[PDB]
Amino acid sequence: AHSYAEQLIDTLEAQGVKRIYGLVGDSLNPIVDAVRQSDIEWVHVRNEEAAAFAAGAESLITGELAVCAASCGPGNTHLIQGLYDSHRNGAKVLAIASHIPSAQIGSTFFQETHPEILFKECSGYCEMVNGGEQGERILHHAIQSTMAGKGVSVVVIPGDIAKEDAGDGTYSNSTISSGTPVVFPDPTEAAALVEAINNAKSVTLFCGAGVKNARAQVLELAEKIKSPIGHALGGKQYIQHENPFEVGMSGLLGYGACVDASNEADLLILLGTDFPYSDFLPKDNVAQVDINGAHIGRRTTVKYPVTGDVAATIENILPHVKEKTDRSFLDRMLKAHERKLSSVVETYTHNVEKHVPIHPEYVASILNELADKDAVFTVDTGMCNVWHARYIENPEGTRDFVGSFRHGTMANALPHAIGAQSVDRNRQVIAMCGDGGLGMLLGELLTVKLHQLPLKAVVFNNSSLGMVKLEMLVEGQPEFGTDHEEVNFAEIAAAAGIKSVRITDPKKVREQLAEALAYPGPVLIDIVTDPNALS
Amino acid sequence: AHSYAEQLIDTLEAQGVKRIYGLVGDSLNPIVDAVRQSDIEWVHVRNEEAAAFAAGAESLITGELAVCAASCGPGNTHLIQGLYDSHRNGAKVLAIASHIPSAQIGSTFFQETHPEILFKECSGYCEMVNGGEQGERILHHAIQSTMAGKGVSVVVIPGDIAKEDAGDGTYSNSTISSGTPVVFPDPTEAAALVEAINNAKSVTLFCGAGVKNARAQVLELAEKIKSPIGHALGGKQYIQHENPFEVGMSGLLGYGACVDASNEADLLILLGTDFPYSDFLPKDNVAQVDINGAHIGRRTTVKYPVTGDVAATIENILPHVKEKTDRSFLDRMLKAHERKLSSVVETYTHNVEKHVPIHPEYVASILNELADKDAVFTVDTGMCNVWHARYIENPEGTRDFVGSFRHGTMANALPHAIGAQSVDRNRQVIAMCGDGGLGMLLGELLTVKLHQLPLKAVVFNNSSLGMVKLEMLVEGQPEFGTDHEEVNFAEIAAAAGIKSVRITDPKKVREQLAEALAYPGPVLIDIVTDPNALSI
Amino acid sequence: AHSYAEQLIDTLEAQGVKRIYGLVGDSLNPIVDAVRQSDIEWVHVRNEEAAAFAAGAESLITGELAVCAASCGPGNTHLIQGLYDSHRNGAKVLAIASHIPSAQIGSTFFQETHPEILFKECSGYCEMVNGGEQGERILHHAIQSTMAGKGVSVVVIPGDIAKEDAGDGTYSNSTISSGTPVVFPDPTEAAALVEAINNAKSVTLFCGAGVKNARAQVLELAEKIKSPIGHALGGKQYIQHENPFEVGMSGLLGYGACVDASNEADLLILLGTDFPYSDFLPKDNVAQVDINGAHIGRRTTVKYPVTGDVAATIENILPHVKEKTDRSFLDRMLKAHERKLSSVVETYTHNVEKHVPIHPEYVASILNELADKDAVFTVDTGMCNVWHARYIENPEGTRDFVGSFRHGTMANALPHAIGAQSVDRNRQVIAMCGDGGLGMLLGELLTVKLHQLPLKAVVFNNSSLGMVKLEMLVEGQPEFGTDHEEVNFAEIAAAAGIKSVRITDPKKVREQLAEALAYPGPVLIDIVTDPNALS
Ligand SMILES: Cc1cc2nc3c(=O)[nH]c(=O)nc-3n(C[C@H](O)[C@H](O)[C@H](O)COP(=O)(O)OP(=O)(O)OC[C@H]3O[C@@H](n4cnc5c(N)ncnc54)[C@H](O)[C@@H]3O)c2cc1C
Ligand SMILES: Cc1cc2nc3c(=O)[nH]c(=O)nc-3n(C[C@H](O)[C@H](O)[C@H](O)COP(=O)(O)OP(=O)(O)OC[C@H]3O[C@@H](n4cnc5c(N)ncnc54)[C@H](O)[C@@H]3O)c2cc1C
Ligand SMILES: Cc1cc2nc3c(=O)[nH]c(=O)nc-3n(C[C@H](O)[C@H](O)[C@H](O)COP(=O)(O)OP(=O)(O)OC[C@H]3O[C@@H](n4cnc5c(N)ncnc54)[C@H](O)[C@@H]3O)c2cc1C
Ligand SMILES: Cc1ncc(C[n+]2csc(CCOP(=O)(O)OP(=O)(O)O)c2C)c(N)n1
Ligand SMILES: Cc1ncc(C[n+]2csc(CCOP(=O)(O)OP(=O)(O)O)c2C)c(N)n1
Ligand SMILES: Cc1ncc(C[n+]2csc(CCOP(=O)(O)OP(=O)(O)O)c2C)c(N)n1
Ligand SMILES: [Mg+2]
Ligand SMILES: [Mg+2]
Ligand SMILES: [Mg+2]
């Protein structure tokens, strides 16, 4: 490795990077020449935004570093949406932002931007390379920052400097710390939490993504104190399945007795969650356990703050928590949960199989039953979040859920599916697309075709910005700009060389979805759904 | 108008705004409720990036304010590429960037970003609304800043504040200054330019977009001092046509004697240009006239700097410039121009009508001949810039050229054509698309269908990132990542409900293009072109 | 508390804030009206830069929240130097940056700046108040972010909004998490460190500020593996005293066998340090333990990275680390260290103690001997860092050292001393000032007089930018712009109403310093020191 471009790629290969998503051009050419000589695969995308989404999804699935790359000015500017999403999701992503020739910086040159400034909000590390040795340092610092969980890292590289001599290897020779530390709470904070639990007659646990490695501990605590368990959308994958305490979700796409259980308990314990809808949370007596102390109390009054890991905190407090024999609150909340879910099933199950346009809730129920027990589900922002949250389950805990749950951008599903599918072509990947989201990055159908990624793109084609239609109904606003003339995505996918099917009959949804999911290759399933569907 | 959302829309309609390009959602809903109750058309796009490009193109065509709007966080984040392009092009654009509810700012809320910080590099004005009266003020300042030529303006509006009471009208009642001032040069700088011209035995004029309102003055000066006229890409629309002094373009996509005339004249005069390729410009004896004094001397050694308008500077100096009777340099440069262009024709014009895959230069020649004399051409960044610069002409000066000439982003052609066509459906709009550029924002074919914009999308389908293929050949780099499996854009357009045709035979290009351009509706013409074809 | 200004001050008082350093004006007036009606003391400063340094120093001394406040535009702009210093030092500081009236934002008004953008690099949290309820939220998030160790927090408050209605109390009622969690390492990283230690025949420990709560563990590990212990400047306060393995410091102001021990050991272990001078560190076999994974390998090749707390990591690995019986390396390094220190004392003690102009090393030795065992020492950036590092010791560990060790700004000593002294007027505070540093913020002598803070300002008056004189000598540059005509700081302090003494005779330094340190009130000691004493 004589040039900085070669040293950068060799360092990524030695770190286990297998693929780089991007689109070649100008200042990125020396870097793509180094990827050509390496054993890293170059994954060409139609729009660099999709490369940043794909890298973020690959990272969420592998737990390892993922990389995207883009040319100068407008090239790396397209990464921004996907970098905000990957950053909010805590993905381990390195973005290679090629930059204009260093001699032209400051001269308002052709394509000039300041990415080293622009990307400061959507990254935990973002610096510009000014030479070989310094480039080697900031590449190490970028990788180490993202592997430590600080979010996206961006390395800005002027094209001429990528062709200059590499550094001496001092920083590229380092081992990267990528382990997960065990964060025990401060004994004083743990004691206050023990006191709050023992003195509450009824407790509710509200779990988020932070309980990922604490399932056994959360269930063990819930059994001891007879607490209903609710979950934020980010914790659904980990705590909803095989859980006899489950009371659902809160917020506008919530369901069941979670809102009641959270607001009626003597004590609410927020476990690894940053659920932002304050109006749904109580203020009277709340505890919060979070690994990042700065996140505690962001969403409601917290009287018992605990900086610590969920599993380690529960292991620390369990011997001091007295077993509660009064289950009346848990039983009352489980009955309320069942009564709410049964009222929906009793009212709507009878005529859903005959309703035209197809009910998206019926599609999601079938998708849950037909998809593999270890499938990856990617979820487009919009009404697909409602269908995923209420109908897609994770029995056996081997399914992965990837979405724009925090940044909330449309169009993530197909590019997320491209990244997730690239990890293992023998694993089923289902993209729950919206017609709005798919239309927004439609050219990524050409990426699916080019790389023959055998993902299953299920389009909930309601010819509408469905979620906006719902917002306007809630606000009392006459609908405007949300519904438009129908689009045939099955014909568009067929024209792009992808196997497709158009589903319009509710009586054929199950069989046609089954055949499409069994097809050994990419498939687009265009389902004509009701834009006004809601239970 | 009780709410700030209604006051904002009423202010835009009083300014003559006819359309807003965008995609509705969350915090933008109160604003679109006001647009619903107004004269303004709501133009739904598939990706907000296309709304920012469309607004920029509409503004370049009308010379008036154009508006784009987007929802909070990820919605307005998508405007960024189009805002950089509109800003670099000097478009008069207002971007309505809806923002998260004000009570959630600073709480790392769902969809939270800081657009009021993010858009500072791609705008001349960018501020956040925090109340009704203050919102009315910054709406005025944003419009006034962009109408005065300071580039894009961004107004960031938290959704809840759009529903609050409007201001009292003090700033919305103002007349906006949109006139063009006449910037005469400092007499000392003009005197130095007069002296430099009279002492030079030979002069060359190199013109850019700044000569837009100075054609008569530039030609009058060129006739008096017998100076060849070359041009930067941004000035091509204005000075190339009906010009007996024309010696072409400079830079890598240049042609003709422009580089010789610029480097051999006793004095080179840069007129309204910021041509960035320094290696092609002389350093010895250069004058520069620019309306923005900060731009002077950015690209080469300038000995005679002049802060001033091109037309006003030329009118100021003309009575003091002595007529040059010696035409030798002009004639020698016009002959050099012809010798350079004839060497290309002698080498490459051999069986072009039979070359397979179709030669893109042949397609561009035919497009130049068949398109209307007042057509709008939008140009995708890449090899289409080469075909546009060398083969699309502007006889009569009634054609408009819109492209990403300064920001250099791919995928601008179709969204620019959507904005340009929306101005007047009876005017022909031709989009010169690249397969890479069209694939990058492919969903905007659904926007063309939805609004039935009768534009003609000509896809130079070379199954390649053509320009990158050329860069790698020049740098001595083995080709990689540029060429990919073929895509049928005609079938994709047909599936999207747009009339289309696929052209693979060079003997049918002329007739099939003629039929497509005559069709009264949107058409996509997918032309399979040679990725290796180039006349050097 | 009806207004947001009152709610803000009530929230700070409920958090235990006793003082606010600042300078009143325009948009800050409603806030100082609320301070007037509270138990919080208002500490008027001459320059808002000093208020930010004072808050940072108070926080480093108490381990609790400290607050500074400034008026709109130019007022809060003056905080910036002190906020960079407090941020780099990890101080727990809240800066109240008053802002122009909200109706004028975006109109290029009189005094308009964008502090909510300007202060992003010198803070972990920086947001603008736009209403009562939102102001209450961001005040909580700012306090919680700084109390969790994320650095300075800035709250930007338009003056008119400070007078508007307060929020409902939801976020102000929260308990703030200020505990210290116990971070155990990932077992795989700890196992690699155990293997590296057991395979090394000789080990050296290089400690920084991160070993503050790990003294016992560091000494315990050092005894087991017979390792010399060196330290970075930030760790001097904690690991230098009562340490039989001590081999000094590294870098240009270093001394003793630290550089030799670090570079000759088979394994170097970086413990809680971010020492930036890479040229003094080895590259061949280095381990690093840091609580922030992003900091690992920033300064040299790290082969054994460990994300974890120093004390918890050592407790975790100790039972697996074999006792090293070979003491040869330790004894060789301790003999080298002792010979280096004793040789200097034997050779120079007489010339330094009698030298005219007074030798600054003699002044620092006297200060070490005469100052209380629990004194606070503040250190001005420049040659005073050399005198502090080499001669001020911390026997019993009850002294505090405050300086601009990371941001490296001049003029911090007197403002740091004002903050440290304000905590407890019965505790001795010694400010080691430079003539350049004191002259830079000379008006703060009026603050010392106004508040009668009984600190002892020792001016090392060498009529020079001493450290710059040394830089130019090392670079081979002819001296220029460093030395200027003598200033009489004792006469200036006397004119400002402060008790002062001018010391020019080395035979009187000890006696006159003893009298000055015993004086019950503020004292400025102007010592004419040798400008050619460059260590
Ligand atoms: C259209 C749309 C609508 C939405 N509607 C809703 C809705 O109605 N209901 C809903 O529930 N969601 C909703 N969401 C998502 C919502 O905005 C939030 O993103 C989500 O609820 C947060 O999930 P979380 O708390 O699991 O994850 P995060 O917000 O990522 O929080 C995880 C937290 O755990 C902490 N943590 C991580 N590891 C550990 C550890 N080991 N120990 C302790 N703490 C740790 C992190 O620091 C963080 O604070 C919606 C999303 C979309 C796109
Ligand atoms: C792929 C690609 C390749 C390119 N290759 C080339 C190439 O080889 N050759 C080439 O020519 N271009 C090339 N371009 C474009 C090139 O980068 C520049 O953007 C362009 O040449 C600048 O044109 P301009 O000077 O007319 O406009 P601008 O750069 O916009 O400059 C116009 C100037 O006029 C000034 N001005 C405005 N109004 C007035 C007035 N009334 N009076 C006086 N001054 C005024 C402005 O302040 C400004 O400084 C390329 C573009 C692309 C996309
Ligand atoms: C004029 C001047 C000259 C200087 N010259 C020198 C010189 O020659 N020599 C020198 O030594 N210094 C010198 N300094 C200071 C030097 O620049 C550094 O600031 C200093 O050496 C860093 O000290 P540190 O590593 O202890 O602290 P920091 O740089 O603050 O690093 C402490 C580290 O410990 C980590 N940490 C914190 N808590 C824990 C925990 N519980 N467990 C594990 N890790 C934890 C932190 O994450 C951080 O990485 C100079 C300063 C000045 C002003
Ligand atoms: C980039 C972007 N633009 C706009 C929005 C606002 N928004 C959120 S959901 C939604 C509608 C999504 O439509 P579609 O993808 O068809 O999903 P549906 O709700 O109809 O299932 C919109 C406009 C957004 N989140 N991201
Ligand atoms: C958003 C963006 N990404 C990348 C580039 C770099 N780039 C400039 S031209 C080009 C190739 C364009 O391909 P296509 O649109 O097919 O045009 P062609 O040159 O093949 O005619 C590329 C990759 C860019 N300018 N903008
Ligand atoms: C604000 C600031 N300006 C400049 C410097 C550069 N600098 C570092 S130390 C120093 C000299 C300090 O002089 P003085 O305070 O008299 O201390 P001395 O070295 O003479 O003891 C200078 C100029 C700095 N660190 N901070
Ligand atoms: Mg939809
Ligand atoms: Mg192409
Ligand atoms: Mg000095």
Task: List the determination method.
Answer: X-ray
Determine the 3-state secondary structure of B478 from DSSP. coil
CA of C244 to the centre of ligand 3 (A): 22
Which residues sit opposite B500 in a β-bridge? B524
Interface test with C, best of B102, B107, B112 (most C CBs within 10 A): B107
Which of A123, A137, A177 should one mutate to test binding to chain C, selecting the residue with the greatest count of C CBs within 10 A? A177
Contact C145, C160 (CB under 8 A): no
Q: Ligand 1: which of A186, A206, A250, A253 to mutate, most ligand atoms within 8 Å of CB?
A: A253
Residues of A with CB under 8 A from a CB of C: 120, 124-125, 140-141, 144-145, 147-150, 170-171, 173-177, 179-186, 188-189, 278, 283, 292-294, 296-298, 300-308
Where in B346-399 does DSSP place strands (E)? 376-379
Asked if residue A143 lies in contact with residue A7, where contact means CB atoms within 8 angstroms, the answer is no
Neighbouring residues of C339: CB distance < 8 A, sequence distance ≥ 6 = none
Closest by alpha carbon to C191, among C313, C96, C104, C92? Answer: C313
Contact A441, A50 (CB under 8 A): yes
Cα–Cα distances (Å) from A323 to A191, A317, A319, A399, C6, in that order, read 16, 12, 10, 33, 44
Give me the sign of the Cα torsion angle C80, C85, C87, C92. Answer: negative
Q: Give the Å distances, CA to CA, from B18 to B12, B15, B55, B153, B402.
A: 9, 9, 11, 18, 20
**Residue C484 C-alpha to ligand 9 middle, in angstroms?**
10
Cβ atoms of residues B68 and B42 within 8 Å: no
DSSP string across C48-71: HHHHHHHHHHHHHHHSS-EEEEE-
Pocket mutation for ligand 4, best pick of B24, B26, B49 (most atoms within 8 Å of C-beta): B26
Task: Give the closest of A179, A300, A308 to C170, CB-based.
Answer: A300
Distance CA C84, CA C42 (A): 23
| Cα separations in angstroms, B203 against B210, B229, B309, C411 | 19, 9, 20, 60
Of A178, A170, A216, A221, the residue nearest A200 (C-alpha): A221
d(CA B6, CA B135): 12
Structure tokens at B175: 């007349």
- Nearest by CB to residue C302, choosing from A175, A304, A308, is A175
| Amino acid identity at A129 | V
Does ligand 6 have an atom closer than 6 angstroms to the CB of C300?
A: no
Please tell me the distance from the alpha carbon of residue B248 to that of residue C356, in angstroms, as a whole number.
Answer: 78
B243, B339 in Cβ contact below 8 A?
Answer: no
Q: Pick from C392, C309, C412: which is nearest to C89 by CA?
A: C412
Q: What does DSSP say about strands B304-307 and B376-379: parallel, antiparallel, or unpaired?
A: unpaired
Measuring CA to CA, which residue among B134, B132, B130, B17 is closest to residue B69? B17
Contacts of residue A353, defined as CB under 8 A and 6 or more positions apart, other chains included, come to A362, A506, A507
Q: Report the distance separating Cα C126 and Cα C99, nearest Å.
A: 13
Which structure tokens are listed for C252? 């240009």
Both structure tokens of C205: 């420990």
Q: How far apart are CA C141 and CA B235, in angstroms?
A: 53
CA distance A323 to chain B (A): 36
User: Is A443 within 8 Å of B446 when comparing Cβ atoms?
Assistant: no
Distance (Å) of CA B387 to CA B145, B366, B430, B463: 35, 11, 14, 17
Residue A467 is assigned to a ligand binding site: yes
Helices and strands counted in chain B (H then E): 22, 18
Q: How many CA atoms lie within 13 A of A374 on its CB side?
A: 5
Q: Are B46 and B444 in contact (CB under 8 A)?
A: yes
**What is the C-alpha radius of gyration for chain C, rounded to an integer number of angstroms?**
24
Most ligand 2 atoms within 8 A of CB, residue of B211, B212, B215, B233 to mutate: B233
Phi–psi pair at B449, nearest 5 degrees: -65, -55
Q: Which residues pair with C310 in a beta bridge?
A: none
Question: What one-letter code names the amino acid at C3?
Answer: S
Q: Please report the number of interchain residue pairs, chain B to chain C, with beta-carbon separation below 8 angstroms.
A: 48
Contacts of A469 in chain B (CB under 8 A): none
CA A189 to chain CA centroid, nearest Å: 31
Helix A360-370 with A509-518: angle, nearest 10 deg: 40
Distance B387 CA to ligand 8 centre (A): 12
Residues of chain B with a CB closer than 8 angstroms to some CB in chain C: 102-107, 117, 127-128, 130-131, 133-134, 137-138, 141, 158
Report the separation in Å between the CA atom of A380 and the middle of ligand 4, taken as the mean of its atom positions. 8
Rg (CA), chain B: 25
Q: Compute the distance between CA of residue C456 and CA of residue C229 in angstroms, rounded to an integer.
A: 33
DSSP assigned state of B265? S
> What is the rounded distance in angstroms from the CA atom of residue B294 to the CA atom of residue B303?
15
- The pair of structure tokens assigned to B447 is 């926007």
Query: What does the block give as tokens for A26?
Result: 């100008």
B498 Cα: distance to centroid of ligand 6 (angstroms): 71
Q: What is the C-alpha to C-alpha distance for residues C430 and C421, in angstroms, rounded to an integer?
A: 9
Per the document, the length of chain B is 536
